[PDB]
Amino acid sequence: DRFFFIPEEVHILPESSAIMVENYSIIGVDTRITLNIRSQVGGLIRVERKKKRIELKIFSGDIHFPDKTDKI
Amino acid sequence: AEYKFPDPIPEFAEAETKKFRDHMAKKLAKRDLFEDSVDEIVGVCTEIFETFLRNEYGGPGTLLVIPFIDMADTLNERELPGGPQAARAAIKWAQDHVDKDWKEWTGTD
Numbered sequence: 001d002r003f004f005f006i007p008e009e010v011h012i013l014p015e016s017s018a019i020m021v022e023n024y025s026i027i028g029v030d031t032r033i034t035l036n037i038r039s040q041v042g043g044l045i046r047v048e049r050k051k052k053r054i055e056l057k058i059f060s061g062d063i064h065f066p067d068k069t070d071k072i
Numbered sequence: 073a074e075y076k077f078p079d080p081i082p083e084f085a086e087a088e089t090k091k092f093r094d095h096m097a098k099k100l101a102k103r104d105l106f107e108d109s110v111d112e113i114v115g116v117c118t119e120i121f122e123t124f125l126r127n128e129y130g131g132p133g134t135l136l137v138i139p140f141i142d143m144a145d146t147l148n149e150r151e152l153p154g155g156p157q158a159a160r161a162a163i164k165w166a167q168d169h170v171d172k173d174w175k176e177w178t179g180t181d
Binding site: 020027 | 075133135136137141144148159160167171
C-alpha cells in the first residue's frame, strides 16, 4: 500500500559526445548538458563512462556534510 | 574543442564578497552555537570565499563545491565551533545570489 519514486534524470550518451558539465558539480534548471540536450532538473552531476557509452546522471537533492559525532 | 569559461571579475568578486560578508555575519549571530566566535568564523570564510571568486569562479556552471568544503575542514582545524554549520550557510546563500548577480553584472541571460 506504498510506493516510491526517486526523480533522477538519467542520460545515455555516446563516447564521442561532448560534455559541458564537470563531474561532481552542481547545476541549475535549464543547464546545458550537450549541444542538443538541456537538463530539465538541476543539481549534483555524476558521470560514468563505459567502453562504448557515456552515462550521465543528474541528481536533485539537498547536500549535507558529515560531522565528527555523526554515525552514518 | 574544450569550453573556455569567462575570466573572473575582480570588481564582481569584491561586490559579491561584501554583500556575502554582510548577509552571513547577521545570520550566524542569531545562532547560539557560535557565541563569541562570530568575527573569527566570519573572517575565515570571507577570505576563502573571496579567493574563489577572484580566481576560479567565472559565471554559471563554475559554482564548485570544493571551496565550501575548504571552510568546513578549516574551522574544525582551528577548533572554531559550527564547522559544518558555517559551510552549510555559505553554500546556501551562494545558490540564491551569486548565480543571479553574475548575469546582471555581465549583461548576459
